[PDB]
Amino acid sequence: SERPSDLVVNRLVLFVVKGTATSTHNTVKPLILLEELGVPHDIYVVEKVSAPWFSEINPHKMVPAILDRSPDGRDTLRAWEATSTLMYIADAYDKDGTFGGRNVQERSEINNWLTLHTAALGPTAKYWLYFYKLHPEKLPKTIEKLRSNITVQYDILERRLNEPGQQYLALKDRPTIADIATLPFAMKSTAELFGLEFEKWPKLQEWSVRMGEREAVKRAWQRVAGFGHGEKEYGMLEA
Amino acid sequence: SERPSDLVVNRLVLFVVKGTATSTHNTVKPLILLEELGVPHDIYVVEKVSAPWFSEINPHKMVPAILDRSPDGRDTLRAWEATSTLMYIADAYDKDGTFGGRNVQERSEINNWLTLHTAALGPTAKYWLYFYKLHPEKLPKTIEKLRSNITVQYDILERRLNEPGQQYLALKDRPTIADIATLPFAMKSTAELFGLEFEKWPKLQEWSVRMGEREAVKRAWQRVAGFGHGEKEYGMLE
């Protein structure tokens, strides 16, 4: 379980895999927040998440994961699970609470809508994709029930965004880590993958377009697609 | 929607349902942290989580949920989703970060092991229980794959608790909201429900017992079992 020669932690390192339509919807989450805050970071493209050295970073053996220097720069720390990477980046780099929440009131709603995604739509979408593509046997009654549960989550988000002045999920005024966490599983392209007509949730669709127009979000989607298709296929990408 | 006349927010209100074997595994989580920190609170036993007035508090229409006064008293705050209720209580009441984490390094590990439960074991256990008991049709291949996924999660927790000096999931020295979130789904009674032999994860079983011996945890289990079975069946308890 020796670390590859090219893995060093001089700044925040974000672990990703080769970019595909179905490999980027969790890794893009911390990348959006890094781009929003302009955090200096490296990208490490993992060839095999099953590799022992990677399990020492993330024992759940998935991307995204982060290695970073401690605030005083003496030690190294780690974040894994997409929602945990958002919480870490906000803690370490969002001192103004622009995306993390400035007070107990803001953080109460951010944590409600962030946790709703982490517990409900996120894992439901993950199980849908697993049974749809990865499970050796096709289980259509299971796939259909998971698809049905996704529409129930879209219904909750739609109700929220129909509330007066509610331009984003947590706060009225600005997007937060709750919006960043939800976006990849609540946009037209992902809805079409699930076999859903996204137009049935108009305020949710409008919200997805508004999030999509943010320069940091555009930069994140642009970059995450390219990782592992460049000059260097695997390992630490050239800064 | 108009609230019941007995629903007033003079302090933290924890929304629960009548105590049964199958109704307490999520509501016990915020109650453990309230007992650990000695947070003043009220208990509201919800008769119907389908009630329109309740969906104004939690749009996911489940317990636990919280109403509380904002620190400055200007707003009524809400928390819903079991993990969010832990985050809220920690934010509002855990001044020293005893359960929430005192520094960026502590919080990085607490949030890792808390989110593992929120995203992996929690929803996996929920889907196992749904397909096992609630789904009109029995889908054994789905139930078996979910049961398998539970054993993989126990394997991860076992690995962690085998690391030198790692007495708790997040921190070596003390339990955190990560441990509180995990306990209800990683103890002998729950393992037995899943048809698993909990002895096959010895360090995880030792950890569950260590958590279980805490006075706050004992009080929380006792109280959550009893809600709705005292003087009052539904509404604000006295």
Short mmCIF file of C-alpha atoms in Angstrom, two decimals:
data_model
loop_
_atom_site.label_atom_id
_atom_site.label_comp_id
_atom_site.label_asym_id
_atom_site.label_seq_id
_atom_site.Cartn_x
_atom_site.Cartn_y
_atom_site.Cartn_z
CA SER A 1 0.00 0.00 0.00
CA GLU A 2 2.86 2.45 -0.94
CA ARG A 3 1.73 5.89 -2.31
CA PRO A 4 2.56 6.50 -6.02
CA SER A 5 5.86 8.46 -6.55
CA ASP A 6 3.92 11.50 -7.99
CA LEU A 7 1.47 11.85 -4.99
CA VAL A 8 2.65 14.84 -2.84
CA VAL A 9 0.48 17.21 -0.67
CA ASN A 10 1.90 20.80 -1.08
CA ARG A 11 -1.76 22.07 -1.31
CA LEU A 12 -5.34 20.62 -1.51
CA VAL A 13 -5.31 17.48 -3.79
CA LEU A 14 -8.74 16.42 -5.25
CA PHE A 15 -8.90 12.70 -6.25
CA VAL A 16 -11.03 12.03 -9.41
CA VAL A 17 -11.32 9.27 -12.09
CA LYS A 18 -11.30 9.42 -15.96
CA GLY A 19 -14.16 11.77 -17.05
CA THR A 20 -17.39 10.19 -18.41
CA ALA A 21 -21.11 11.27 -18.34
CA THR A 22 -21.61 8.91 -15.30
CA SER A 23 -18.21 9.32 -13.44
CA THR A 24 -18.28 13.12 -12.64
CA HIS A 25 -21.61 13.87 -10.81
CA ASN A 26 -19.98 13.51 -7.31
CA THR A 27 -16.37 14.75 -8.11
CA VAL A 28 -17.80 17.97 -9.77
CA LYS A 29 -19.31 18.98 -6.33
CA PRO A 30 -16.03 19.88 -4.49
CA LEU A 31 -14.61 21.19 -7.85
CA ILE A 32 -17.53 23.73 -8.15
CA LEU A 33 -16.77 25.03 -4.58
CA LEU A 34 -12.96 25.16 -5.25
CA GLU A 35 -13.70 27.24 -8.44
CA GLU A 36 -16.27 29.50 -6.58
CA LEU A 37 -13.72 30.34 -3.77
CA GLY A 38 -10.59 30.26 -6.05
CA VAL A 39 -8.84 27.71 -3.74
CA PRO A 40 -5.39 26.62 -5.05
CA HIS A 41 -5.55 22.82 -5.69
CA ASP A 42 -4.07 19.85 -7.64
CA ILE A 43 -6.02 17.07 -9.49
CA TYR A 44 -5.01 13.38 -9.03
CA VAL A 45 -6.62 10.95 -11.57
CA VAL A 46 -6.97 7.51 -9.81
CA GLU A 47 -6.61 4.50 -12.19
CA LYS A 48 -8.02 1.94 -9.65
CA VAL A 49 -10.06 3.02 -6.55
CA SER A 50 -9.57 -0.67 -5.43
CA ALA A 51 -5.76 0.05 -5.06
CA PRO A 52 -4.68 -0.46 -1.39
CA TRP A 53 -2.86 2.97 -1.22
CA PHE A 54 -6.19 4.76 -2.08
CA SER A 55 -8.15 2.82 0.65
CA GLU A 56 -5.73 4.42 3.23
CA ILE A 57 -7.10 7.84 1.99
CA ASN A 58 -10.79 6.75 1.54
CA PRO A 59 -11.73 3.40 3.20
CA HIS A 60 -15.02 3.51 1.15
CA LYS A 61 -12.75 3.31 -2.01
CA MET A 62 -14.59 6.00 -4.08
CA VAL A 63 -13.97 9.50 -5.56
CA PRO A 64 -14.14 12.26 -4.70
CA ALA A 65 -11.53 12.31 -1.88
CA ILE A 66 -9.19 15.10 -0.63
CA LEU A 67 -5.73 15.23 0.98
CA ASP A 68 -4.71 18.72 2.28
CA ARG A 69 -2.22 20.36 4.72
CA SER A 70 -3.58 21.19 8.25
CA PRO A 71 -4.15 24.95 8.88
CA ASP A 72 -0.66 25.28 10.58
CA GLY A 73 0.88 23.25 7.67
CA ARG A 74 2.58 20.65 9.99
CA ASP A 75 0.18 17.68 9.34
CA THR A 76 -2.01 16.23 6.51
CA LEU A 77 -5.81 15.63 6.80
CA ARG A 78 -8.41 13.94 4.50
CA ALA A 79 -12.07 14.36 3.39
CA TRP A 80 -14.19 11.68 1.61
CA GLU A 81 -17.89 11.33 0.67
CA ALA A 82 -18.91 14.21 -1.71
CA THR A 83 -20.88 16.06 1.06
CA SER A 84 -17.86 15.73 3.47
CA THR A 85 -15.50 17.32 0.83
CA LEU A 86 -17.96 20.32 0.57
CA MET A 87 -18.09 20.61 4.42
CA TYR A 88 -14.22 20.45 4.64
CA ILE A 89 -13.58 23.06 1.85
CA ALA A 90 -16.21 25.41 3.45
CA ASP A 91 -14.60 24.93 6.95
CA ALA A 92 -10.97 25.49 5.73
CA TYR A 93 -11.45 28.06 2.88
CA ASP A 94 -14.95 29.75 3.24
CA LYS A 95 -14.13 32.01 6.26
CA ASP A 96 -16.88 34.56 5.22
CA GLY A 97 -19.50 31.71 5.18
CA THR A 98 -20.59 32.75 1.61
CA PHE A 99 -21.39 29.04 0.77
CA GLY A 100 -21.23 27.47 4.30
CA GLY A 101 -23.60 29.93 6.10
CA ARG A 102 -22.73 33.08 8.14
CA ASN A 103 -24.82 32.25 11.30
CA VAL A 104 -26.92 29.51 13.07
CA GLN A 105 -30.11 30.51 11.10
CA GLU A 106 -28.45 30.20 7.61
CA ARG A 107 -26.56 26.97 8.62
CA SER A 108 -29.88 25.39 9.91
CA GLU A 109 -31.48 25.59 6.37
CA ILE A 110 -28.17 24.82 4.49
CA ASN A 111 -27.76 21.60 6.60
CA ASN A 112 -31.47 20.61 6.07
CA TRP A 113 -31.27 20.79 2.21
CA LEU A 114 -27.62 19.49 2.09
CA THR A 115 -28.58 16.46 4.31
CA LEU A 116 -31.83 15.85 2.30
CA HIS A 117 -29.60 15.36 -0.82
CA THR A 118 -26.93 13.30 1.11
CA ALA A 119 -29.59 10.89 2.58
CA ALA A 120 -32.39 10.79 -0.09
CA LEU A 121 -31.76 11.81 -3.78
CA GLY A 122 -27.96 11.12 -3.68
CA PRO A 123 -28.08 7.46 -2.47
CA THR A 124 -31.36 6.76 -4.41
CA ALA A 125 -29.67 8.01 -7.66
CA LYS A 126 -26.51 5.92 -6.81
CA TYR A 127 -28.60 2.70 -6.33
CA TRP A 128 -30.61 3.48 -9.54
CA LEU A 129 -27.33 3.75 -11.59
CA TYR A 130 -25.93 0.58 -9.87
CA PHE A 131 -28.97 -1.67 -10.71
CA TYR A 132 -29.42 0.01 -14.18
CA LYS A 133 -25.78 -0.50 -15.42
CA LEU A 134 -23.47 -2.27 -12.87
CA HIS A 135 -25.46 -5.16 -11.19
CA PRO A 136 -24.78 -8.43 -13.15
CA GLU A 137 -28.59 -9.15 -13.39
CA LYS A 138 -31.25 -6.60 -14.56
CA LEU A 139 -33.87 -6.04 -11.76
CA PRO A 140 -36.49 -3.78 -13.47
CA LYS A 141 -39.04 -3.67 -10.53
CA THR A 142 -36.17 -2.36 -8.26
CA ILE A 143 -34.94 0.12 -10.98
CA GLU A 144 -38.59 1.39 -11.42
CA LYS A 145 -39.13 1.91 -7.62
CA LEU A 146 -35.81 3.88 -7.39
CA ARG A 147 -36.88 5.99 -10.47
CA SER A 148 -40.26 6.63 -8.69
CA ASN A 149 -38.36 7.73 -5.49
CA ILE A 150 -36.30 10.24 -7.62
CA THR A 151 -39.60 11.91 -8.81
CA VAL A 152 -40.71 12.18 -5.09
CA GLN A 153 -37.39 14.05 -4.35
CA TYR A 154 -37.93 16.34 -7.44
CA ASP A 155 -41.48 17.05 -6.03
CA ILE A 156 -39.98 18.19 -2.63
CA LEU A 157 -37.35 20.45 -4.38
CA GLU A 158 -40.12 21.85 -6.71
CA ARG A 159 -42.37 22.72 -3.67
CA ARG A 160 -39.38 24.54 -1.98
CA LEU A 161 -38.52 26.59 -5.15
CA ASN A 162 -42.27 27.57 -5.50
CA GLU A 163 -42.11 29.35 -2.05
CA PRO A 164 -42.17 33.20 -2.36
CA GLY A 165 -38.66 34.63 -3.12
CA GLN A 166 -36.97 31.18 -2.73
CA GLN A 167 -34.42 31.57 -5.62
CA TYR A 168 -32.11 28.82 -4.13
CA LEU A 169 -32.80 25.68 -1.98
CA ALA A 170 -31.42 26.82 1.46
CA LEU A 171 -31.25 30.67 1.30
CA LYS A 172 -33.39 33.10 -0.78
CA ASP A 173 -30.40 35.37 -1.64
CA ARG A 174 -27.52 33.11 -2.85
CA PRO A 175 -26.44 29.51 -3.64
CA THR A 176 -24.82 27.40 -0.84
CA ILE A 177 -23.17 23.92 -0.51
CA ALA A 178 -26.82 22.60 -0.44
CA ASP A 179 -27.35 23.87 -4.06
CA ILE A 180 -23.88 22.62 -5.22
CA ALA A 181 -24.60 19.11 -3.74
CA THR A 182 -28.09 18.90 -5.40
CA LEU A 183 -27.32 20.36 -8.90
CA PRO A 184 -25.63 17.31 -10.58
CA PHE A 185 -28.69 15.06 -9.75
CA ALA A 186 -31.30 17.79 -10.58
CA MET A 187 -30.47 19.03 -14.15
CA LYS A 188 -32.07 18.20 -17.57
CA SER A 189 -29.22 15.83 -18.76
CA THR A 190 -29.37 13.68 -15.53
CA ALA A 191 -33.24 13.71 -15.58
CA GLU A 192 -33.06 12.41 -19.22
CA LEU A 193 -30.64 9.61 -18.05
CA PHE A 194 -33.29 8.64 -15.38
CA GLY A 195 -35.94 8.61 -18.20
CA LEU A 196 -37.83 11.64 -16.74
CA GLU A 197 -39.30 14.79 -18.43
CA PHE A 198 -37.55 17.58 -16.41
CA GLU A 199 -40.14 20.17 -17.71
CA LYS A 200 -42.67 18.59 -15.22
CA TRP A 201 -40.69 20.50 -12.47
CA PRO A 202 -40.52 24.05 -13.94
CA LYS A 203 -39.07 25.98 -10.89
CA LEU A 204 -36.50 23.14 -10.36
CA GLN A 205 -35.52 23.37 -14.10
CA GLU A 206 -35.25 27.23 -13.85
CA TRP A 207 -33.07 26.83 -10.67
CA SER A 208 -30.79 24.29 -12.52
CA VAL A 209 -30.31 26.79 -15.45
CA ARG A 210 -29.56 29.68 -12.96
CA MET A 211 -26.90 27.48 -11.19
CA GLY A 212 -25.62 26.39 -14.67
CA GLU A 213 -24.95 30.04 -15.75
CA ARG A 214 -22.45 30.62 -12.82
CA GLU A 215 -18.86 30.90 -14.25
CA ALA A 216 -17.43 28.58 -11.49
CA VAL A 217 -20.05 25.85 -12.36
CA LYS A 218 -19.20 26.13 -16.14
CA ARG A 219 -15.41 25.87 -15.34
CA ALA A 220 -16.03 22.78 -13.08
CA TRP A 221 -18.15 20.84 -15.70
CA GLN A 222 -15.59 21.82 -18.43
CA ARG A 223 -12.57 20.50 -16.41
CA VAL A 224 -14.17 17.33 -14.85
CA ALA A 225 -15.01 15.97 -18.40
CA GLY A 226 -11.31 16.31 -19.48
CA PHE A 227 -9.54 14.61 -16.49
CA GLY A 228 -7.67 11.47 -17.71
CA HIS A 229 -8.16 12.28 -21.47
CA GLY A 230 -5.16 14.70 -21.62
CA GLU A 231 -1.35 14.37 -22.05
CA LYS A 232 -1.25 12.38 -18.73
CA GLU A 233 -3.95 9.62 -18.35
CA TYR A 234 -3.45 8.74 -14.61
CA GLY A 235 -1.73 10.35 -11.57
CA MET A 236 -0.93 13.99 -10.58
CA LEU A 237 -2.00 16.34 -13.46
CA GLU A 238 0.50 19.10 -14.45
CA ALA A 239 -0.46 22.39 -12.64
CA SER B 1 -51.57 25.44 7.88
CA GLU B 2 -52.80 26.06 11.49
CA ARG B 3 -50.70 24.21 14.16
CA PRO B 4 -52.27 22.31 17.11
CA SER B 5 -53.08 24.75 20.02
CA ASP B 6 -50.54 22.90 22.30
CA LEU B 7 -47.57 23.43 19.85
CA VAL B 8 -45.59 26.44 21.29
CA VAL B 9 -41.78 27.07 20.91
CA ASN B 10 -40.45 28.43 24.28
CA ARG B 11 -37.32 26.20 23.83
CA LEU B 12 -36.05 23.42 21.47
CA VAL B 13 -39.02 21.13 20.52
CA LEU B 14 -38.09 17.58 19.34
CA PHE B 15 -40.86 15.97 17.16
CA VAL B 16 -41.15 12.15 17.67
CA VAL B 17 -43.85 9.43 17.17
CA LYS B 18 -45.20 6.82 19.68
CA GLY B 19 -42.27 4.63 20.91
CA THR B 20 -42.00 1.16 19.24
CA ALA B 21 -39.14 -1.24 18.26
CA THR B 22 -39.20 0.23 14.67
CA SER B 23 -40.00 3.99 15.29
CA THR B 24 -37.00 5.18 17.42
CA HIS B 25 -33.70 4.40 15.51
CA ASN B 26 -33.57 7.99 14.00
CA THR B 27 -35.38 10.08 16.73
CA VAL B 28 -32.97 8.64 19.42
CA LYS B 29 -30.00 10.39 17.63
CA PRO B 30 -30.83 14.08 18.43
CA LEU B 31 -32.15 12.95 21.90
CA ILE B 32 -28.71 11.35 22.74
CA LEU B 33 -26.93 14.69 21.92
CA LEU B 34 -29.59 16.73 23.89
CA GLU B 35 -28.96 14.41 26.93
CA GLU B 36 -25.10 14.56 26.49
CA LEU B 37 -25.05 18.43 26.44
CA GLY B 38 -27.98 18.91 28.92
CA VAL B 39 -29.93 21.05 26.37
CA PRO B 40 -33.34 22.22 27.71
CA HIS B 41 -36.03 20.79 25.34
CA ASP B 42 -39.71 19.72 24.95
CA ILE B 43 -41.05 16.49 23.30
CA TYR B 44 -43.98 16.65 20.79
CA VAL B 45 -45.50 13.21 19.91
CA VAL B 46 -46.88 13.55 16.30
CA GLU B 47 -50.03 11.37 15.73
CA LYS B 48 -49.87 11.72 11.88
CA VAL B 49 -46.63 12.78 10.02
CA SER B 50 -48.99 13.16 6.95
CA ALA B 51 -50.68 16.18 8.70
CA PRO B 52 -50.28 19.33 6.52
CA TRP B 53 -49.10 21.41 9.59
CA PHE B 54 -46.16 18.94 10.10
CA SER B 55 -45.08 19.12 6.37
CA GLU B 56 -44.60 22.93 6.96
CA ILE B 57 -41.91 21.89 9.58
CA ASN B 58 -40.45 18.89 7.63
CA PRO B 59 -41.34 18.68 3.88
CA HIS B 60 -39.95 15.05 3.93
CA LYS B 61 -42.84 14.31 6.42
CA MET B 62 -40.76 12.20 8.92
CA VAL B 63 -39.37 12.33 12.52
CA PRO B 64 -37.10 13.50 13.91
CA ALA B 65 -37.73 17.23 13.31
CA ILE B 66 -36.89 20.29 15.52
CA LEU B 67 -38.39 23.77 16.01
CA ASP B 68 -36.23 26.17 18.12
CA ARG B 69 -35.90 29.96 18.76
CA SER B 70 -32.95 31.55 16.83
CA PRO B 71 -30.09 32.75 19.14
CA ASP B 72 -31.28 36.44 18.76
CA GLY B 73 -34.98 35.33 19.10
CA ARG B 74 -35.99 37.02 15.76
CA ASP B 75 -36.80 33.73 13.85
CA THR B 76 -38.12 30.17 14.47
CA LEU B 77 -35.42 27.74 13.15
CA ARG B 78 -36.18 24.17 11.93
CA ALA B 79 -33.97 21.04 11.57
CA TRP B 80 -35.05 17.79 9.77
CA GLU B 81 -33.19 14.67 8.54
CA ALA B 82 -31.60 12.89 11.59
CA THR B 83 -28.03 14.06 10.63
CA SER B 84 -29.22 17.72 10.21
CA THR B 85 -30.80 17.69 13.76
CA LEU B 86 -27.33 16.60 15.13
CA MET B 87 -25.59 19.39 13.08
CA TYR B 88 -28.14 22.00 14.37
CA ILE B 89 -27.89 21.00 18.11
CA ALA B 90 -24.02 21.01 17.83
CA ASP B 91 -24.06 24.47 16.10
CA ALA B 92 -26.53 26.08 18.60
CA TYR B 93 -25.51 24.32 21.91
CA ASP B 94 -22.06 22.52 21.60
CA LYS B 95 -20.01 25.70 22.43
CA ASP B 96 -16.74 23.74 23.12
CA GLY B 97 -17.14 21.40 20.05
CA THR B 98 -17.09 18.38 22.45
CA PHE B 99 -19.29 16.39 19.95
CA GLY B 100 -18.99 18.65 16.82
CA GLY B 101 -15.15 19.06 16.76
CA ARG B 102 -12.90 21.85 18.21
CA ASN B 103 -10.63 22.42 15.12
CA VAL B 104 -10.55 21.90 11.28
CA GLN B 105 -8.62 18.56 11.72
CA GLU B 106 -11.19 17.08 14.22
CA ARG B 107 -14.17 18.30 12.07
CA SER B 108 -12.59 16.76 8.88
CA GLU B 109 -12.75 13.22 10.45
CA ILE B 110 -16.13 13.82 12.27
CA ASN B 111 -17.72 14.90 8.92
CA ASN B 112 -16.08 11.91 7.09
CA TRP B 113 -17.62 9.26 9.45
CA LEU B 114 -20.93 11.20 9.94
CA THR B 115 -21.42 11.52 6.11
CA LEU B 116 -20.44 7.81 5.61
CA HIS B 117 -23.51 6.99 7.82
CA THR B 118 -25.74 9.69 6.17
CA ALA B 119 -24.92 8.50 2.57
CA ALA B 120 -24.02 4.74 2.93
CA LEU B 121 -25.17 2.64 6.00
CA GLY B 122 -28.22 4.86 6.83
CA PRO B 123 -29.89 4.79 3.35
CA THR B 124 -28.78 1.13 2.74
CA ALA B 125 -30.44 0.03 6.06
CA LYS B 126 -33.57 2.13 5.15
CA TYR B 127 -33.85 0.44 1.67
CA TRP B 128 -33.23 -3.04 3.23
CA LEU B 129 -36.09 -2.42 5.77
CA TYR B 130 -38.41 -0.98 3.01
CA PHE B 131 -37.96 -3.97 0.59
CA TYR B 132 -37.98 -6.51 3.52
CA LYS B 133 -41.21 -5.27 5.26
CA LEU B 134 -42.98 -2.39 3.43
CA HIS B 135 -42.78 -3.00 -0.41
CA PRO B 136 -46.01 -4.79 -1.53
CA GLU B 137 -43.94 -7.44 -3.45
CA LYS B 138 -40.95 -9.40 -1.97
CA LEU B 139 -37.77 -8.84 -4.10
CA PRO B 140 -35.24 -11.26 -2.49
CA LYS B 141 -32.32 -10.53 -4.96
CA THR B 142 -32.59 -6.78 -4.06
CA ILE B 143 -32.92 -7.54 -0.26
CA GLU B 144 -29.83 -9.87 -0.47
CA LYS B 145 -27.68 -7.22 -2.31
CA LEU B 146 -28.64 -4.59 0.36
CA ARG B 147 -27.83 -7.08 3.22
CA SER B 148 -24.42 -7.71 1.50
CA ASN B 149 -23.83 -3.89 1.35
CA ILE B 150 -24.53 -3.69 5.16
CA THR B 151 -21.76 -6.34 5.80
CA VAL B 152 -19.32 -4.21 3.64
CA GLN B 153 -20.18 -1.10 5.79
CA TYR B 154 -19.63 -3.09 9.08
CA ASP B 155 -16.27 -4.25 7.50
CA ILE B 156 -15.25 -0.53 7.02
CA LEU B 157 -16.26 0.39 10.65
CA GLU B 158 -14.41 -2.76 11.94
CA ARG B 159 -11.22 -1.75 9.98
CA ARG B 160 -11.36 1.80 11.52
CA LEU B 161 -11.83 0.51 15.14
CA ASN B 162 -8.82 -1.90 14.65
CA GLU B 163 -6.46 1.12 14.04
CA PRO B 164 -4.10 1.79 17.02
CA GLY B 165 -5.86 3.77 19.84
CA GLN B 166 -9.03 4.36 17.69
CA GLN B 167 -11.67 3.92 20.50
CA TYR B 168 -14.35 5.91 18.52
CA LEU B 169 -15.10 6.23 14.74
CA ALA B 170 -13.99 9.89 14.18
CA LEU B 171 -11.63 10.75 17.12
CA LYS B 172 -9.38 8.42 19.24
CA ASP B 173 -10.23 10.14 22.58
CA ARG B 174 -14.06 10.73 22.68
CA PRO B 175 -17.40 10.07 20.91
CA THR B 176 -18.76 12.66 18.38
CA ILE B 177 -22.01 13.19 16.35
CA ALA B 178 -20.46 10.61 13.90
CA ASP B 179 -20.65 7.92 16.69
CA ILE B 180 -24.21 9.06 17.71
CA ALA B 181 -25.46 8.82 14.05
CA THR B 182 -23.89 5.32 13.56
CA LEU B 183 -24.88 3.58 16.88
CA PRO B 184 -28.58 2.73 16.15
CA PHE B 185 -27.60 0.85 12.90
CA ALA B 186 -24.38 -0.76 14.37
CA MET B 187 -25.54 -2.59 17.57
CA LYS B 188 -26.39 -6.29 18.31
CA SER B 189 -30.24 -5.83 18.20
CA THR B 190 -30.07 -4.13 14.72
CA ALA B 191 -27.44 -6.65 13.40
CA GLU B 192 -29.85 -9.49 14.49
CA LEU B 193 -32.77 -7.76 12.61
CA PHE B 194 -30.53 -7.81 9.43
CA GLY B 195 -29.89 -11.58 10.06
CA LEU B 196 -26.18 -10.92 10.87
CA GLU B 197 -23.93 -12.32 13.67
CA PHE B 198 -22.60 -9.10 15.34
CA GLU B 199 -19.77 -11.13 17.05
CA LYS B 200 -18.17 -11.37 13.51
CA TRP B 201 -17.22 -7.63 14.03
CA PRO B 202 -15.66 -7.74 17.55
CA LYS B 203 -14.15 -4.18 17.72
CA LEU B 204 -17.47 -2.74 16.34
CA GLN B 205 -19.43 -4.74 19.01
CA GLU B 206 -16.98 -3.54 21.78
CA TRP B 207 -17.54 0.08 20.50
CA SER B 208 -21.40 -0.36 20.52
CA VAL B 209 -21.22 -1.58 24.20
CA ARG B 210 -18.85 1.35 25.14
CA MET B 211 -21.38 3.83 23.57
CA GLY B 212 -24.28 1.92 25.28
CA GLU B 213 -22.71 2.33 28.79
CA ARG B 214 -22.83 6.20 28.49
CA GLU B 215 -25.55 7.58 30.88
CA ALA B 216 -26.88 9.99 28.15
CA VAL B 217 -27.30 7.04 25.68
CA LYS B 218 -29.12 4.91 28.37
CA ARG B 219 -31.47 7.87 29.23
CA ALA B 220 -32.14 8.54 25.47
CA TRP B 221 -33.15 4.86 24.74
CA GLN B 222 -35.41 4.73 27.89
CA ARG B 223 -37.22 8.03 27.01
CA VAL B 224 -37.68 7.31 23.22
CA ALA B 225 -39.31 3.88 24.03
CA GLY B 226 -41.75 5.58 26.50
CA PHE B 227 -42.93 8.60 24.39
CA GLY B 228 -46.73 8.34 23.78
CA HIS B 229 -47.18 5.61 26.50
CA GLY B 230 -47.32 8.00 29.53
CA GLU B 231 -50.09 10.37 30.82
CA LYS B 232 -50.43 11.91 27.27
CA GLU B 233 -50.63 9.83 24.01
CA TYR B 234 -50.16 12.62 21.37
CA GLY B 235 -49.08 16.31 21.42
CA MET B 236 -46.76 18.31 23.75
CA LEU B 237 -45.60 16.09 26.71
CA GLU B 238 -45.38 17.62 30.26
#
